[PDB]
C-alpha cells in the first residue's frame, strides 16, 4: 500500500522518516512538502478528491487553523492518547503533537546574570531599555506565545507587556529567530526571545556561539515556559484513513520520536523518550500545561495585540 504525507517540515527531516517506516512496514510513504499556509490551502481546495492522507504541520496555531477549516478528521487512538500528553494534542482528537519546542529567553551570559531574568513580562521592565531584541510579530511562533500570554494573564496585562517590549528594543525586530540569536552573539542584543531548536541548530553549526548566547527557561515560578508543537492528523477525505492513523501512531513511538524530534533539536512529545543530549544539556524546566490549541483560539487576539503595541 501507499500513503501521502503533506508536510510543512523541511524535506530532509521527513526523508529518513518515510524511509524508516517503509522499511518497517512495507508501506510507501510519499512526502509532499510546502509552507504550512499554502499546504493547508491546497489541502482545503483539493476537497473530497485529495491524494493526501496525513497532514504534518508546525505550531498549534496552524494545527488549530487546519481544524477550523475542516480538513482533518478526528480519530480515537488509544496509542496516541497514551504516548502524547493531553496538553500537546487536539482536545477533539483532530491532531497530535509529535515534537516539542520552547519559545523562551536567551541572554548573553557575559552581560546578564540569570538572576536578572524571570518572566516574559519582566522583559518589559525599563531596566531592559535598549537591550531587548525580538523576532518579527509577523510569525506564528510569536502569535502563539502572545496568544497564551493573553490566556494566562489577560488582555490588559499583555497589552502592557508587549508595549513595554517594543519600548525596550535595541533594534528593529528580526526576520527570523536565527538572525536574532546571531545578533545576541554579535553584541547588538543582550536578551531576546526565540525557539529552542534554532539555538541547538546554531550551536551545532557554531559551538562558540555558546560563549555569548545562553538559554533561560522563563516563568518557572508561575505556569511554566511556553511550549509549542509540530503535529499531525489524518486528513478528512483520506482514502487510507486506517493506514494514515497507523503512521501517526508510529511517529509517537520511541524509535520514530528520535528521528523526528532529536534530528531538529526539538524535545520529544512522548515523555518516555529522553531528549537528545544536545537538548537535554540545557537542563530540566517546568513547561506550561495549557493546551497548545489555545495558540490558535487566541491567534486573532494576539495579532491585534502586537499591532496595537507597534510590534512590527
Ligand atoms: Na526578573
Ligand atoms: Na518598557
Ligand atoms: Na497555563
Residue numbers in the entry: 1 to 312
Show me the paper's own sentences about this structure.
Like MhFbpA and Thermus thermophilus FbpA (TtFbpA), McFbpA adopts a typical fold of class III periplasmic iron binding protein with the two globular lobes. Similar to other FbpA structures, McFbpA has two globular α/β domains named the N terminal lobe (Asn1-Trp95 and Val235-Val273) and the C terminal lobe (Tyr107-Ala221 and Thr274-Lys312). Each of the lobes consists of α helices surrounding a twisted mixed β sheet in the center. These two lobes are connected by a pair of antiparallel β strands (Phe96-Phe106 and Gly222-Val234), which acts as a hinge allowing for the adoption of either the open or closed conformation. Isogenic mutants of FbpA and AfeA were constructed, demonstrating that FbpA is essential for the utilization of human Tf and Lf as iron sources and that AfeA does not take up iron from these iron sources.
Two crystallization conditions were identified within 1 week after setup, producing the apo (colourless) and the holo (red–orange) crystal forms. Our structural studies yielded the structure of M. catarrhalis FbpA in two different forms: an apo open form and an iron-holo open form. Comparisons with other FbpAs indicate that both iron-holo and apo McFbpA in this study are in the open conformation. Two high resolution crystal structures of the M. catarrhalis FbpA were solved in the iron-holo open and apo open conformations, revealing more details about the mechanism behind FbpA-mediated iron transport. The process of how iron is bound in a class III FbpA has been proposed in studies with T. thermophilus FbpA (TtFbpA). The proposed mechanism of iron binding with insights from both the previous study and the current study is illustrated in Fig. 7. The synergistic anion (e.g., carbonate) binds to the open FbpA through the arginine residues in N terminal lobe (Step 1). The ferric ion then binds to the three tyrosines in the C terminal lobe (Step 2) which results in the FbpA adopting a closed conformation through bidentate binding of iron by the carbonate anion (Step 3).
